[PDB]
Write a protein that binds this ligand. Structure first.
Ligand SMILES: Oc1ncnc2cn[nH]c12
Length: 282
C-alpha cells in the first residue's frame, strides 16, 4: 500500500464518473470509492487499486504481488491517469469564470500510451458507450487473463495486435481501415516510433502522428490530451464540442478557444461538462 499526494480541490466524483463510463469490461472496475484495473509492465502482471482519502488528500495505491517488482512505474502510471501534479489554483486562476463551476476538475490521463492510442482510434465516429463495448471485444479476443485474478484480463499487447487478422478486428464492429490503423499502431509501438511519454514539442509530434494511416486530427488531439496529458489541446472537431458551439465551424471554434491558452485541455474538460454552456459575443 503506497501513498501519493494531491492538492485540493480534487473532484473525485467527476473523475471516477468519467472513467466508469469509459471503463472496459473485464479490464477496469470503477466504483464510488475506488478504481482498479489489470496492468502489465513487461512480463509483470497484476491488479492495481487506487483508493482516495479525500480528507487527507492522499491517494492510496494497492498492487497485487505480480506488480511489486515494478511498483514505482505502477505508481507513476496512476499519477498520470489521475493528474496528481495539477495545481488547481493556477489553472482556475487563468481559466477564470469557466472553471468556477467545478474547480476540482482534473485531466484524465492513461496507464499506457499504446493502450490509449488504441482507445482513441476505437473512439472514432462513435459514442463513449459503443466505444467501450467495442474495446471490450477487442480485449476479450486479444487480451490475456490473469492467473491469480481470473476475473481480470490485460489489455491486448502490441505483439498480439500486430499479428491480428484485419478481418478479425473488423468483425468486432469496425471498418477495415480502422482495423488496419490499429495493426499499424501496434507495430509503431514495437519499433518505438509512437511516443510513450509526452514529447517536448507536441504540435510537431501530433503532425507526425497524423501521417499514420487512420489517424485524423480528432484522434491525434484526443490521443495527445489523454495519451500524453498535454494541457493545451482543444478538440474543435469533437462532436459534443460542435453542440456547445452551434453554427461555428471547426476553424471558428479553434479561434474561440485560443483565449484559454495555455490550458485548453482543461478548458475542453469544463466545456464538455457544462451542460448549458454557450459562447460569448464580440
Ligand atoms: O471521431 C470522432 N470525431 C469527433 N468527435 C468525436 C466524438 N467521438 N468520436 C469522435
Amino acid at each position: 500500500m503506497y501513498t501519493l499526494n494531491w492538492q485540493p480541490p480534487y473532484d473525485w466524483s467527476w473523475m471516477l464518473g468519467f472513467l466508469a463510463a469509459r471503463a472496459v469490461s473485464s479490464v477496469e472496475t470503477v466504483a464510488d470509492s475506488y478504481y482498479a484495473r489489470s496492468l502489465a509492465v513487461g512480463e509483470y502482471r497484476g491488479v492495481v487499486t487506487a483508493i482516495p482519502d479525500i480528507a487527507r488528500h492522499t491517494l492510496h495505491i494497492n498492487l497485487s504481488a505480480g506488480l511489486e517488482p515494478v511498483a514505482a512505474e505502477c505508481l507513476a502510471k496512476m499519477s498520470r491517469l489521475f493528474d496528481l501534479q495539477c495545481n488547481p489554483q493556477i489553472v482556475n486562476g487563468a481559466l477564470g469564470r469557466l472553471g468556477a463551476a467545478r474547480p476540482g476538475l482534473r485531466l484524465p490521463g492513461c496507464v499506457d500510451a499504446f493502450e490509449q492510442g488504441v482507445r482513441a482510434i476505437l473512439g472514432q465516429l462513435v459514442s463513449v458507450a459503443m466505444a467501450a463495448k467495442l474495446t471490450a471485444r477487442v480485449a476479450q479476443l486479444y487480451g490475456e487473463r490473469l492467473d491469480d485474478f481470473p476475473e481480470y484480463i490485460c489489455f491486448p499487447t502490441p505483439q498480439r495486435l500486430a499479428a491480428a487478422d484485419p478481418q478479425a478486428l473488423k468483425a468486432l464492429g469496425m471498418p477495415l481501415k480502422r482495423a488496419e490503423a490499429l495493426i499499424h499502431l501496434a507495430n509503431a509501438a514495437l519499433e518505438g516510433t509512437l511516443p510513450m511519454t509526452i514529447p517536448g514539442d507536441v504540435e510537431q509530434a501530433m503532425k507526425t502522428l497524423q501521417t499514420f494511416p487512420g489517424i485524423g486530427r480528432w484522434t491525434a488531439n484526443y490521443f495527445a490530451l489523454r495519451g500524453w496529458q498535454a494541457k493545451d489541446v482543444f478538440l474543435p472537431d469533437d462532436y459534443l464540442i460542435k453542440q456547445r458551439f452551434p453554427g461555428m465551424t471547426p476553424a471558428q471554434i479553434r479561434r474561440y478557444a485560443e483565449r484559454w491558452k495555455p490550458w485548453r485541455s482543461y478548458a475542453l474538460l469544463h466545456i464538455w461538462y457544462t451542460e448549458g454552456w454557450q459562447p460569448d459575443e464580440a
